Amino acid sequence: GKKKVCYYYDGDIGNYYYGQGHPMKPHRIRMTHNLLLNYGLYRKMEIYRPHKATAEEMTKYHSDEYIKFLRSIRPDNMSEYSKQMQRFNVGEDCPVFDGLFEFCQLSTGGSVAGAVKLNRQQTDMAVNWAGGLHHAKKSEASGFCYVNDIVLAILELLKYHQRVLYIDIDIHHGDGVEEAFYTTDRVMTVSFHKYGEYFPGTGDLRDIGAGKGKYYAVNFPMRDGIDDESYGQIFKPIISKVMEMYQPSAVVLQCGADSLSGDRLGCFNLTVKGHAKCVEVVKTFNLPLLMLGGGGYTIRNVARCWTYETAVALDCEIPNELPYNDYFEYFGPDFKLHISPSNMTNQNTPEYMEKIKQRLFENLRMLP
């Protein structure tokens, strides 16, 4: 039935600024929080302010040198770190900004705190919209991500769970998470993403894991314009088969909103209902679940998406008419929660979707 939901948020998160022209806007997390507060969704959730994760907590995955660099670099001293900036991939996508380290600490803190709460069996679901930064690597920043809060949260879950399932619905391949666990069977990573002349360039159908991890990495490559009907028809069957064969005891779901119609960087055509159907599907399995953020670059739609997904987690129905809020004008000209898909062509034919699903089903038959 209805579950207990713990939500992690720091009121300072919206003030971190990647810089002029950078599409990643932490302010979208504050818009989400304010919208969900004005819908009354605070009355049913336990709200927590995450601790600032320590460099030590971060080094459970990342190298000591990379975390020391992140904790030391600032816009005023960048000139003295040109060598380490190249080595750790700090540049246009992952710039140095005021409070970069604290932003990483808050993003990571929410994910790890949520994982601890799930481990202690004190909540059914934990939500951290500031997390889900799936591209960060052991000693390298990538694609707007510096510290891989997801990998850290999964390592925390692995203390009490033999098998953890990771599902990623961001439009970009979940490469950092896939790479971290590529050679183990204790985590199964499942990513649905645009593949072909698109960042990060990984996530081929044929990337299925290695060694003990062979068959424990699943990739569903898609083309432009996927819609609710098409996504829905493959998501539930794949996740159901993964649940059946893998039998995970905890799940982490990355809810990157750049898979929505009208995203500034994305090329998919999902509505908020289509995206949220993934949360409904996963929630139905009644397993401890950590829901995380990720991409999303048309910020009014990211706030709508994550507000609706928080309502889905709470089994609370909320009206389509948006309540008045601090950012009301951002939701014009309609001031509604739900969005309409565009007229873009769906290049994922029904036959292509079935064929890729059948290839993934063949790989899933190889599990013990």
Ligand X SMILES: CCC(O)(O)CCCCC[C@H](NC(=O)C1CN(C)C1)c1[nH]c(-c2ccccc2)nc1C(N)=O
Residue positions annotated with a catalytic role: 135
Q: CB within 8 A of 120, min separation 6: which ones?
A: none
Taking residues 137 to 176 in sequence order and writing x for each that binds ligand X by CB under 6 A, - otherwise, the string is ------xxx------------------------x-x----
Nearest distance from C-beta of residue 93 to ligand X, angstroms: 5
Considering only residues 232 to 291 of the shown chain, the ones binding Zn ion according to CB under 5 A are 256, 258
Taking residues 103 to 142 in sequence order and writing x for each that binds ligand X by CB under 6 A, - otherwise, the string is ------------------------------xxx-------
Measured from the CB atom, the residue of 39 and 103 that comes closer to ligand X is 103
Asked whether position 191 contacts Ca ion by CB under 5 A, the answer is yes
Placement of tokens 């950078």 in the chain: 22
Considering only residues 163 to 182 of the shown chain, the ones binding Ca ion according to CB under 5 A are 168, 170, 174, 181
* Alpha helix positions (H), 60-200: 64-72, 82-87, 100-119, 149-157, 175-180
Give the Cα separation of 356 and 192 in Å (integer): 11
* Alpha helix positions (H), the chain: 27-38, 55-58, 64-72, 82-87, 100-119, 149-157, 175-180, 228-246, 272-283, 299-314, 350-364
Nearest distance from C-beta of residue 221 to ligand X, angstroms: 15
What single DSSP character describes residue 109?
Answer: H
Measured from the CB atom, the residue of 196 and 350 that comes closer to Zn ion is 196
Query: How far from 125 is each of 16, 246, 305, 309, CA to CA, in Å?
Result: 26, 20, 17, 12
Query: How far from 115 is each of 2, 7, 276, 291, CA to CA, in Å?
Result: 20, 12, 22, 10
Q: Residue 327 corresponds to which tokens in the numbers above?
A: 């950012």
* 168 known ligand binder: yes
Asked whether position 295 contacts Zn ion by CB under 5 A, the answer is yes
Taking residues 65 to 104 in sequence order and writing x for each that binds ligand X by CB under 6 A, - otherwise, the string is ---------------------------xx-----------
**Angle (CA) 196 338 261, round 5°:** 15
Nearest CA to 232 among 191, 266, 271?
Answer: 271
Neighbours of 134 (CB within 10 A): 31
Nearest distance from C-beta of residue 155 to Zn ion, angstroms: 22
The answer to whether residues 248 and 185 touch, using CB atoms and an 8 Å cutoff, is no
Measured from the CB atom, the residue of 73 and 222 that comes closer to Ca ion is 222
Q: CB within 8 A of 277, min separation 6: which ones?
A: 228, 231, 232, 235
* 195 known ligand binder: no
Asked whether position 368 contacts ligand X by CB under 6 A, the answer is no
Q: Which of the choices ligand X, Zn ion, Ca ion, none does residue 310 contact, using the CB cut-off of 5 to 8 A by kind?
A: none
Nearest distance from C-beta of residue 83 to ligand X, angstroms: 20
Asked whether position 170 contacts Zn ion by CB under 5 A, the answer is yes
Nearest distance from C-beta of residue 172 to Zn ion, angstroms: 4
Asked whether position 216 contacts Ca ion by CB under 5 A, the answer is yes
Dihedral sign from CA coordinates of 148, 149, 151, 156: positive
Considering only residues 240 to 299 of the shown chain, the ones binding ligand X according to CB under 6 A are 256, 258, 265, 294-295
Give the SS3 label for residue 195: coil
* 42 known ligand binder: no
Residue list, annotated binding site for Zn(2+):
170, 172, 258
Specify binding-site residues for Ca(2+). Answer: 168, 170, 172, 181, 184, 187, 191-192, 216
Residues that bind ligand X (CB under 6 A): 21-23, 92-93, 133-135, 143-145, 170, 172, 199, 256, 258, 265, 294-295
